[PDB]
Structure formats: structure tokens, C-alpha cells
Amino acid sequence: EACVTSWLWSEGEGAVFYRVDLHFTNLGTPPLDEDGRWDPALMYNPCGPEPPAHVVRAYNQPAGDVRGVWGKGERTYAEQDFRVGGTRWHRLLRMPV
Amino acid sequence: EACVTSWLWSEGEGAVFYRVDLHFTNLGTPPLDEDGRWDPALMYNPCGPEPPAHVVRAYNQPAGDVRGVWGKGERTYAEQDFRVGGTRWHRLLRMPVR
Ligand SMILES: CCCCCCCCCCCC[N+](C)(C)[O-]
Ligand SMILES: CCCCCCCCCCCC[N+](C)(C)[O-]
Ligand SMILES: CCCCCCCCCCCC[N+](C)(C)[O-]
Ligand SMILES: CCCCCCCCCCCC[N+](C)(C)[O-]
Ligand SMILES: CCCCCCCCCCCC[N+](C)(C)[O-]
Ligand SMILES: CCCCCCCCCCCC[N+](C)(C)[O-]
Ligand SMILES: CCCCCCCCCCCC[N+](C)(C)[O-]
Ligand SMILES: CCCCCCCCCCCC[N+](C)(C)[O-]
Ligand SMILES: CCCCCCCCCCCC[N+](C)(C)[O-]
Ligand SMILES: CCCCCCCCCCCC[N+](C)(C)[O-]
Numbered sequence A: 001e002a003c004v005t006s007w008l009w010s011e012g013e014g015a016v017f018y019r020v021d022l023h024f025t026n027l028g029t030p031p032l033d034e035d036g037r038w039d040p041a042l043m044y045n046p047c048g049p050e051p052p053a054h055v056v057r058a059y060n061q062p063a064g065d066v067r068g069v070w071g072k073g074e075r076t077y078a079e080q081d082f083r084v085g086g087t088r089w090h091r092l093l094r095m096p097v
Numbered sequence B: 001e002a003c004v005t006s007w008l009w010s011e012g013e014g015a016v017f018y019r020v021d022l023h024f025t026n027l028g029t030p031p032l033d034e035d036g037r038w039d040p041a042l043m044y045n046p047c048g049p050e051p052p053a054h055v056v057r058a059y060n061q062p063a064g065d066v067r068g069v070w071g072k073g074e075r076t077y078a079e080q081d082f083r084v085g086g087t088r089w090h091r092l093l094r095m096p097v098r
């Protein structure tokens, strides 16, 4: 694996709390198919089933502002909070910067 | 059970290209340990080993600017580009409903 973890949560009524595991795959060398040809699947074919749309939109939402960075040992995460629709969201992101 | 896909890539020399699969787990009901207690690992224990630090920094880099949205059928993705260090990165993120 190449893997990092993020966290995401809502405020208010019906607040949700999600762990999200980001698995990275390098596309520099593609896999082979049964005929020995390069298989381009990993470059365009998305995984599924997807989580609820408001959760995906919340996690992927563009937001430039960082409320602050947390740290313990040599692990640093950044916390962001923002509104999508009428819901307030927080996400916590690995940030080795 | 619950998964979305994003794409990440560099411009220029030693330009890289990554698929990132995002696996979501709902933490509302924790799993049980062998003695019947609630196990809190999923709320704080990060997965690993991690990809290169510059790759993580680039994918995670906060950024509010969207160069544009791409669409086919009922699938919409947003494309963002920005500089990290001396490298220009693009990322493609699933974005309902834009
Ligand atoms: C070694 C024991 C560690 C246990 C610490 C548990 C404290 C977490 C409490 C979560 C509180 C949620 N909230 C939003 C009110 O902060
Ligand atoms: C295979 C049926 C359709 C052909 C798709 C082949 C796409 C070639 C893409 C070139 C990109 C190669 N590279 C090294 C950047 O990964
Ligand atoms: C049957 C499907 C055929 C798909 C062929 C798609 C060709 C895409 C080539 C990748 C382009 C690389 N680059 C740098 C210009 O983005
Ligand atoms: C740089 C990535 C370019 C590779 C993209 C290849 C897209 C091929 C889509 C072909 C559609 C397959 N099918 C089964 C619907 O015919
Ligand atoms: C169904 C969703 C389709 C997603 C396909 C996205 C392909 C991204 C192509 C990026 C390639 C850029 N570059 C420079 C490596 O060629
Ligand atoms: C720079 C290369 C561009 C690659 C873009 C390839 C897009 C393929 C989209 C296939 C999705 C069609 N589908 C299944 C959603 O209907
Ligand atoms: C080493 C990584 C440390 C991660 C820190 C996680 C912080 C989450 C804080 C949520 C509670 C915020 N507040 C306002 C109640 O303090
Ligand atoms: C060994 C220490 C374990 C302490 C467990 C921390 C309890 C925090 C509870 C947070 C509640 C989250 N949720 C969704 C289950 O409600
Ligand atoms: C609501 C968020 C839940 C946060 C709860 C975090 C539990 C952390 C427990 C850490 C214990 C590690 N230790 C010291 C036992 O090895
Ligand atoms: C070093 C890993 C850091 C552990 C990350 C802990 C994330 C906990 C975030 C607080 C959860 C807020 N809430 C509402 C569920 O209590």
C-alpha cells in the first residue's frame, strides 16, 4: 500500500463522523491484461459504490483557509472548517509540509 | 462498501501520475473487541505506510480555486491546479452536483 488517513465531521443535528483512507496508486507502469497489453482501467475507471453525495462534496470541497495545525511528534495535521449548504463541516488532513 | 476516486498529476520533468482511491468509513457505530468493549482505533489510528511526503502534501493541499468542471453524463469532476515547492500539480476530484 501507499496510504494516508483523513478525518471528517459535521456540526449540529444529525452530525456525522467519517474516517477516510486515501490509497495511492502510481500509474507510471500499468498492469497487463490476459493478452499482454497494457490495461488503462486504473487511469479512468472510478471505484464504487460511492458514499452519499453530500459527504463526498463535503470532503472534496475546495477551501483555502486553515483554522490551524495540530501536531504530535513528527505528525502534523491541518484542520479546516467550512459551510456546505446549511451544514458546518470540519476536516482534518495529513500535512507533512 | 463506500469509495470515491480522484486523480493527481505533475507538470514538467519527472512528472508523476497517481490514482487515489478514497475509502470512507462511518464512525457512528464502533466495532467490538474480543471482550465486548468498543474499539476506538478507527477514530485516531492512521493507516500506512504513507506515500512520498510531497505527494501527500500536493494531494491534500488546501485550495479554493477551481480552473473548471468536467462533465460526462451525471458525473461531474472539478479540476484544480496549484504550485507546491517548485512544482505545478493538478488534481481531479468528484464533485456533486457542482
Ligand atoms: C486513553 C484514553 C483516551 C480517551 C479520550 C477520549 C476523549 C474524546 C472525547 C470526544 C469529545 C467530542 N467532542 C466534540 C465533544 O469533542
Ligand atoms: C487501451 C484502449 C484505449 C487506449 C488508452 C491508452 C492511453 C495511453 C495513455 C498514455 C499515458 C501513458 N503514461 C506513461 C503517462 O502513463
Ligand atoms: C478507446 C479509448 C482511446 C483513449 C485514448 C486516449 C488518449 C489519451 C492520451 C493521454 C494524453 C497525455 N497528455 C499529457 C496529453 O495529457
Ligand atoms: C490518460 C487516460 C486515458 C485513458 C482513458 C481511456 C478511456 C476508454 C473508455 C472506453 C469505454 C469502454 N467501453 C466499455 C465503454 O467501451
Ligand atoms: C469517469 C471519470 C474519468 C476520469 C479520468 C481522468 C483522467 C485524468 C487524466 C490526467 C492525465 C494528465 N497527464 C498529464 C498525466 O496526462
Ligand atoms: C487527458 C485524457 C482524457 C481522459 C478522459 C477519459 C474520460 C472517460 C470517461 C468515461 C466515462 C463514461 N461513462 C462511463 C461515465 O459514461
Ligand atoms: C497529531 C495529530 C493531532 C490531531 C488533532 C486532532 C484535533 C481535533 C480537534 C477537534 C476539537 C476542536 N476543539 C475546538 C474542540 O478544540
Ligand atoms: C481506551 C480509550 C477509549 C476511549 C474512547 C473514546 C470515546 C469517544 C466517544 C466519541 C463518540 C463518537 N460516536 C460516533 C461513537 O459517538
Ligand atoms: C471522538 C473522537 C475520538 C477520539 C478518541 C481517541 C482515542 C485515543 C486513544 C489513544 C490511546 C493510545 N494508547 C496510549 C493507549 O496507546
Ligand atoms: C494522529 C492521529 C490524529 C487522530 C485524529 C482524531 C480525530 C478526532 C476528531 C474529533 C471528532 C469530533 N467529534 C464531533 C466526532 O467529536
Ligand SMILES: CCCCCCCCCCCC[N+](C)(C)[O-]
Residues within 6 Å of the ligand: A072, B044
Ligand atoms: C477531539 C478529541 C479527540 C482528540 C484525539 C487525538 C488523539 C491523538 C492520538 C495520537 C496518538 C499518540 N500515540 C502515542 C498513541 O501515538
Ligand SMILES: CCCCCCCCCCCC[N+](C)(C)[O-]
Residues within 6 Å of the ligand: B070, B071, B072, B075, B076, B077, B079, B092
Ligand atoms: C467525467 C469527467 C472526467 C473528465 C476528466 C478530464 C480531465 C483531463 C484533463 C487533462 C488535460 C486537459 N487539458 C489538456 C485541456 O489541459
Ligand SMILES: [Cl-]
Residues within 6 Å of the ligand: A059, A060, A061, B059, B060
Ligand atoms: Cl481535499
